[PDB]
Amino acid sequence: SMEDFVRQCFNPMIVELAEKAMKEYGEDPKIETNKFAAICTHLEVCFMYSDFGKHRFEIIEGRDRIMAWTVVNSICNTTGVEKPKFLPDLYDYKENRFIEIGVTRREVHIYYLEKANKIKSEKTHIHIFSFTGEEMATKADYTLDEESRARIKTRLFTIRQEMASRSLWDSFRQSERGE
Ligand SMILES: O=C(O)c1[nH]ccc(=O)c1O
Ligand SMILES: [Mn+2]
Ligand SMILES: [Mn+2]
């Protein structure tokens, strides 16, 4: 059911990446369905984010760990930027900074506090999106123009409403898994 929805609303490439991420962690997407959906949603948000930007953004999320760290190392060696302790989601060649993307079912400020306390690196920019059209970013610097952020918010709200139409939203939002 939730698996059916995930396979019907996300393109096969994102679904395959999410299935691979869960097989890496060791979880079955048919039991941990909310994890599955959250991972698909986060991947799709990262890909939209990087695609709205001469390519401005370098996608790090969605890569196997070897290639992710290869990309991070190459960026740090060609820019002198400090090497993050956690694999970030994108690199911004325009602002020259790593971006950690957050998609939460909780209030954006709660999840922002959580992620900022986690990464504890004053150089990784944080951008939190909610399923309610809310966002919170480091220094209120949202990076993207209004149209791209609007499209991301629209896609997230649409995912939420598609879950609600299938009676999947209550379970998904009451779970923190995937964040
Ligand atoms: O990189 C990850 O593994 C990860 N995990 C949970 C939430 C995120 O936003 C994220 O980027
Ligand atoms: Mn990530
Ligand atoms: Mn992220």
Numbering used by the authors: 0 to 52, 73 to 198
The authors write:
Among the most important influenza virus targets is the RNA-dependent RNA polymerase acidic N-terminal (PAN) endonuclease, which is a critical component of the viral replication machinery. PAN is part of a heterotrimeric RNA-dependent RNA polymerase complex, which is composed of PA, PB1, and PB2 subunits. The PA subunit, which enables endonucleolytic cleavage, is composed of a C-terminal domain that is mostly structural and an N-terminal domain that is catalytically active. In native PAN, the Mn2+ cations are coordinated by His41, Glu80, Asp108, Glu 119, and Ile120 and five water molecules, producing an octahedral coordination geometry at each metal center.
Previous work has focused on the identification of MBP fragments and their evolution into lead-like molecules by FBDD.20−22 A carboxylic acid-modified hydroxypyridinone MBP was reported to achieve IC50 values as low as ∼17 nM against PAN. As anticipated, the addition of a bromine atom to the MBIs produced no apparent change in the binding to the active site metal ions (compare structures of 1 and 2) and aided in ligand placement within the electron density map. Both compounds 1 and 2 coordinated by bridging the metal ions through the phenolate donor. Compounds 1, 2, 3, and 5 present the same triad and display similar binding poses, coordinating Mn1 through the ketone and Mn2 through the carboxylate, with the hydroxyl group bridging Mn1 and Mn2.21 The binding and inhibitory activity (vide infra) of these compounds are comparable to those of the parent MBP 1. Compounds 1 and 2 showed similar inhibition activity, indicating that the bromide did not impact metal-binding relative to the parent compound. Both compounds display high binding energy per atom (ligand efficiency, LE).
